[PDB]
Amino acid sequence: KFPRVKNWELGSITYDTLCAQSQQDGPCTPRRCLGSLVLPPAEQLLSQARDFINQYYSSIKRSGSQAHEERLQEVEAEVASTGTYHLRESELVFGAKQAWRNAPRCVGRIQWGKLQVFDARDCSSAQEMFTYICNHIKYATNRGNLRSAITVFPQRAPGRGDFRIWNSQLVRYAGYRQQDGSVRGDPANVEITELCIQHGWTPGNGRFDVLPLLLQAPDEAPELFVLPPELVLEVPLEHPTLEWFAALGLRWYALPAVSNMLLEIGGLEFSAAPFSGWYMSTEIGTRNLCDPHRYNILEDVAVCMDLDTRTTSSLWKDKAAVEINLAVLHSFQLAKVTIVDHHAATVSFMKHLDNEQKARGGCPADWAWIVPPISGSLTPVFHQEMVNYILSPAFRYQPDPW
Amino acid sequence: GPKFPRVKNWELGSITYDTLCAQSQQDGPCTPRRCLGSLVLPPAEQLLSQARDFINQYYSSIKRSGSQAHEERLQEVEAEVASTGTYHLRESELVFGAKQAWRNAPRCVGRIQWGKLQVFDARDCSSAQEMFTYICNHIKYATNRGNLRSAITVFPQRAPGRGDFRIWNSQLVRYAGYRQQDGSVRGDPANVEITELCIQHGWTPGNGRFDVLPLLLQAPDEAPELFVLPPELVLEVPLEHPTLEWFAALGLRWYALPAVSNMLLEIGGLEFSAAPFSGWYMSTEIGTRNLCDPHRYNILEDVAVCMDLDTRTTSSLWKDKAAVEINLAVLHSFQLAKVTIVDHHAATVSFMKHLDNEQKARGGCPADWAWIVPPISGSLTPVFHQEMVNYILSPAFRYQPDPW
Ligand code: HEM
Ligand code: HEM
Ligand SMILES: Cc1cc(N)nc(C[C@@H]2CNC[C@@H]2OCCN[C@@H]2C[C@H]2c2cccc(Cl)c2)c1
Ligand SMILES: Cc1cc(N)nc(C[C@@H]2CNC[C@@H]2OCCN[C@@H]2C[C@H]2c2cccc(Cl)c2)c1
Ligand SMILES: C[C@H](O)[C@H](O)[C@H]1CNc2nc(N)[nH]c(=O)c2N1
Ligand SMILES: C[C@H](O)[C@H](O)[C@H]1CNc2nc(N)[nH]c(=O)c2N1
Ligand SMILES: [Zn+2]
Numbered sequence: 001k002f003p004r005v006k007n008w009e010l011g012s013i014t015y016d017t018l019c020a021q022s023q024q025d026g027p028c029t030p031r032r033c034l035g036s037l038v039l040p041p042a043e044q045l046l047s048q049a050r051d052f053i054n055q056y057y058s059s060i061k062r063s064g065s066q067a068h069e070e071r072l073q074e075v076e077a078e079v080a081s082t083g084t085y086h087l088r089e090s091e092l093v094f095g096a097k098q099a100w101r102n103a104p105r106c107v108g109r110i111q112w113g114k115l116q117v118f119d120a121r122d123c124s125s126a127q128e129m130f131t132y133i134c135n136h137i138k139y140a141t142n143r144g145n146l147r148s149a150i151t152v153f154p155q156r157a158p159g160r161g162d163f164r165i166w167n168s169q170l171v172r173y174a175g176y177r178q179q180d181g182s183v184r185g186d187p188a189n190v191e192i193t194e195l196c197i198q199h200g201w202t203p204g205n206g207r208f209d210v211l212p213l214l215l216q217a218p219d220e221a222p223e224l225f226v227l228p229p230e231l232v233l234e235v236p237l238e239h240p241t242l243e244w245f246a247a248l249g250l251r252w253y254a255l256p257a258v259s260n261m262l263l264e265i266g267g268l269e270f271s272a273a274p275f276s277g278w279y280m281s282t283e284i285g286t287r288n289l290c291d292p293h294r295y296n297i298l299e300d301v302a303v304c305m306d307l308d309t310r311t312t313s314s315l316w317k318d319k320a321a322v323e324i325n326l327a328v329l330h331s332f333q334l335a336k337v338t339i340v341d342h343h344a345a346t347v348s349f350m351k352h353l354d355n356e357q358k359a360r361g362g363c364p365a366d367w368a369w370i371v372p373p374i375s376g377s378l379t380p381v382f383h384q385e386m387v388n389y390i391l392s393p394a395f396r397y398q399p400d401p402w
Numbered sequence: 403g404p405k406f407p408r409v410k411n412w413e414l415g416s417i418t419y420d421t422l423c424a425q426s427q428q429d430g431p432c433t434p435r436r437c438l439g440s441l442v443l444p445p446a447e448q449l450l451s452q453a454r455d456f457i458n459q460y461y462s463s464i465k466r467s468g469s470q471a472h473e474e475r476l477q478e479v480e481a482e483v484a485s486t487g488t489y490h491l492r493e494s495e496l497v498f499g500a501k502q503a504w505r506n507a508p509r510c511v512g513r514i515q516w517g518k519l520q521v522f523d524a525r526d527c528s529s530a531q532e533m534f535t536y537i538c539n540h541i542k543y544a545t546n547r548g549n550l551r552s553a554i555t556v557f558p559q560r561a562p563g564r565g566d567f568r569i570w571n572s573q574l575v576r577y578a579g580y581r582q583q584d585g586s587v588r589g590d591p592a593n594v595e596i597t598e599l600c601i602q603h604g605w606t607p608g609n610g611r612f613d614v615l616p617l618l619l620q621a622p623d624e625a626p627e628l629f630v631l632p633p634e635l636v637l638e639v640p641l642e643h644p645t646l647e648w649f650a651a652l653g654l655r656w657y658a659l660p661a662v663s664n665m666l667l668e669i670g671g672l673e674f675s676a677a678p679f680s681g682w683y684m685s686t687e688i689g690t691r692n693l694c695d696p697h698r699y700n701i702l703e704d705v706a707v708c709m710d711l712d713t714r715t716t717s718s719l720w721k722d723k724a725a726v727e728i729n730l731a732v733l734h735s736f737q738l739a740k741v742t743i744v745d746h747h748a749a750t751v752s753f754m755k756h757l758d759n760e761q762k763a764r765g766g767c768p769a770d771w772a773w774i775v776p777p778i779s780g781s782l783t784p785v786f787h788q789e790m791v792n793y794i795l796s797p798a799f800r801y802q803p804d805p806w
Contacts, residue, residue: 003431003438009697019436028432028439032423032793034407035432035439036771286781293413298782312747313733318726318779322719329717343716367440367772373786375722377690377777378702388437 009383016387018362024390035388036368039397042079045267049075049085052266056091083158087268093117095265096150099393105369108277110348111148118151126215126223129153134231137170140276141233141255146338150275155268162271164401166214166222167192170257170274171232174209185209187293199224208251235335239327244304252284254337265393278338280345285325286373321374342372346379364389413787420791422766428794439792440772443801446483449671453479453489456670460495487562491669497521499669500554503797509773511749512681514756520553527557530619530627537574538635544680545637545659550742554679559672567676568805570618570626571596574661574678575636578613589613591697599806603628612655639739643731648708656688658741665799682742684749689729690777725778746776750783768793
């Protein structure tokens with residue numbers, strides 16, 4: 001019933017009892033594990049709502065109190081009459097923090113309790129979405145001293161289309177498909193880049209052109225808004241000892257801000273609820289810059305370092321990947337922008353596992369996403385068994401709206 | 403596509419569907435409520451059905467399915483189990499089965515080599531002394547003076563009410579771990595327990611960081627007996643670095659032959675409790691796990707100090723730079739000594755080819771993502787971007803609880 005969870009570096013054992021509170025099935029069966037896949041009525045809404053109100057009142061130590069009983073009554077009265085209901089701002093706040101807490105793929109969960117929640121449920125136009133988005137960015141960025149934040153737009157409603165941000169992140173770089181099928185800029189964004197142009201954006205021709213936002217209010221065509229350049233904090237990349245590196249013209253933006261995920265609380269769904277923390281450096285250094293279907297710079301750097309490229313066993317890839325990561329950390333530290341390296345992040349994550357063992361008897365965790373993409377077994381999370389499962393409130397992936 | 407898992411490669415965009423998982427006859431540890439994919443360790447009725455299935459497998463593989471010889475073999479297996487409670491494999495069935503157990507092993511990145519396995523049949527073995535002889539022969543053949551050859555030696559199967567053949571060591575070649583005065587370990591902390599066992603059965607211990615352990619070999623219903631391997635049989639590689647001249651001065655070394663000895667090989671419900679097998683190393687196992695794991699030789703900090711790195715802060719990436727150079731030293735040194743080794747890039751490229759071969763041959767390939775992705779430079783290798791489906795096929799290698 002309750003799985004045994006062993007750390008292989010230390011010999012210690014815990015039992016995860018939290019996984020019994022999971023009420024949604026994941027992709028695995030006893031026949032086959034699918035853990036490595038990235039994407040494998042009123043009475044039901046009513047029990048999800050009840051369960052969530054139960055979680056909220058218990059979080060403020062007021063289970064069973066008058067306020068608790070009466071709030072369950074309001075929920076039932078609203079659902080019975082209308083087929084839906086609405087959260088109080090205090091509940092939205094709690095539910096957002098909890099969705100972060102519950103997110104198995106996030107290594108930054110030590111911070112879960114410290115989240116600025118902007119309530120944007122009074123948004124009625126793409127124009128007003130844009131203003132709220134600009135304020136989020138400004139607040140979150142904070143001149144380099146990054147602060148976690150989420151802005152929550154109006155929930156899904158049975159009668160109509162969703163509020164949606166077409167971009168997968170608030171800040172991403174354009175990818176321009178070229179005459180010969182090569183790409184200038186970020187290959188991951190060729191499509192969204194092509195949508196912006198078709199909606200009348202004038203494109204740059206750089207490797208690092210910040211995309212405009214395509215914002216959609218219900219049942220409307222999306223609308224194009226250019227972010228004012230001074231709101232978008234960026235970090236030029238240079239290397240502590242390798243002088244030519246700065247001349248690569250490389251850079252990355254300060255604010256990692258995910259804008260394509262659906263936030264589910266109490267059975268209510270928030271299709272537009274962008275959120276942001278700060279980067280762990282290996283995502284820029286290793287994945288964005290070195291993935292072969294991304295900026296793919298490993299080979300260029302290796303040659304700059306005069307390494308022997310002809311053979312895999314000179315470990316030229318590993319060597320360049322390391323320097324690129326070092327350059328990311330150095331450059332962020334120099335521009336005084338918050339960032340965490342994979343060693344510090346994974347150590348904080350182990351502390352989080354321990355806090356959650358005590359607080360709730362387990363912590364859902366996706367080993368393949370937690371373990372960084374370089375130096376896996378050099379971090380303590382490599383040696384740590386993890387149980388993965390879905391708790392609610394939750395963040396969920398949603399496919400591109402086009 | 404159909405009702406079978408969709409499997410995507412995020413680097414290339416390509417898609418396949420795993421249909422082989424349909425053939426899985428054994429439950430793993432995951433359920434719809436929770437994934438346990440990351441845990442290391444999670445009778446006449448039964449035997450005959452497992453045997454029938456394996457015999458069907460063997461006959462498919464020789465293209466004689468439904469034939470007279472197929473039906474006759476099935477009838478011979480039922481009759482054997484009918485009067486003895488067990489049955490015995492033909493020589494060629496054993497060879498097929500041992501290859502298929504390797505092919506089926508989800509944690510092995512070396513499976514491109516699966517069809518090329520020397521299978522030594524040692525089902526006649528009747529003493530610990532004879533196991534020692536067979537093992538020495540395996541080591542000589544497999545090592546082949548540095549030009550390593552995949553091989554497995556299969557000792558007699560488990561029998562009704564008679565003790566097992568067991569190799570107590572987890573590998574044929576491992577270094578001792580000596581528990582010290584101050585609670586620190588000299589040698590390999592992984593082997594502290596087996597070392598104390600060898601001392602208790604009469605071994606005179608050394609006191610180095612790299613003393614080869616003797617073998618503790620158990621024949622049916624006997625205490626294990628101790629056998630020291632002649633040192634000329636155990637090929638080792640002293641470690642040096644191509645540009646950092648002081649690295650050789652560290653006196654680090656590793657052995658050439660990775661030879662696992664505590665796994666159970668299961669074939670058609672028959673259980674081979676002693677069946678040690680060997681390949682060649684993927685370098686990151688020595689360079690990263692054996693030498694840098696905090697709970698193993700743990701040398702990262704010493705090497706970073708020699709490299710003059712800032713070990714007082716995580717953001718210098720001193721761990722990452724040191725691990726890269728140790729991995730490089732391992733590759734260079736093996737290449738110098740002319741001992742077969744494969745780097746994590748070449749291994750993972752070759753496993754991607756294997757996945758494509760098996761997609762065509764069998765419609766999928768059971769694979770354990772957490773084990774296949776290497777412990778340094780994960781996303782620099784193609785396997786990081788490849789979804790994998792994990793399930794248990796038989797014939798299989800199963801982990802065995804230590805006999806002590
Ligand atoms: C405060 C600093 C934070 C750090 C250092 C951090 C770290 C990370 C990392 C490295 C990932 C994997 C990224 C990838 O490979 O795509 C991730 C995933 C994720 N994080 Fe965080 N995180 C932070 C804050 C937040 C916040 C504020 C939230 C939500 C309120 C959040 C929710 C999530 C979710 C839902 C995922 C999975 C995203 C997906 O499926 O694409 N994290 N985190
Ligand atoms: C031919 C060269 C080979 C290479 C490069 C190779 C590579 C590897 C590696 C790197 C591992 C993970 C080891 C660990 O982290 O503990 C492994 C596991 C494994 N391989 Fe291979 N392998 C080879 C040959 C073999 C052979 C000949 C067999 C059996 C016939 C085999 C069966 C296995 C099994 C059963 C495991 C899992 C062991 C465990 O769970 O502890 N492999 N392989
Ligand atoms: C198909 C698909 C499914 C899912 N679940 N995620 C994705 C997004 C895929 C999954 N890894 C790459 C791509 O995301 C890049 C964005 N990463 C977040 C910026 C980093 C981040 C870092 C620190 C804090 C925060 Cl809040 C966020 C795609
Ligand atoms: C509790 C436990 C369970 C399992 N399944 N395996 C182990 C052994 C644990 C799991 N990873 C570390 C430890 O093995 C180190 C030795 N690995 C074999 C040398 C490598 C190898 C390499 C190439 C070819 C071959 Cl035939 C074999 C322990
Ligand atoms: C196929 C595999 O699951 C996929 O490449 C995952 C692996 N681990 C990851 N880990 C993080 N943090 N982010 C990712 O995008 C991925 N990709
Ligand atoms: C907890 C985790 O499953 C464990 O440390 C695994 C991860 N991946 C591994 N992969 C390989 N090849 N060998 C191992 O020993 C491990 N250890
Ligand atoms: Zn699973």
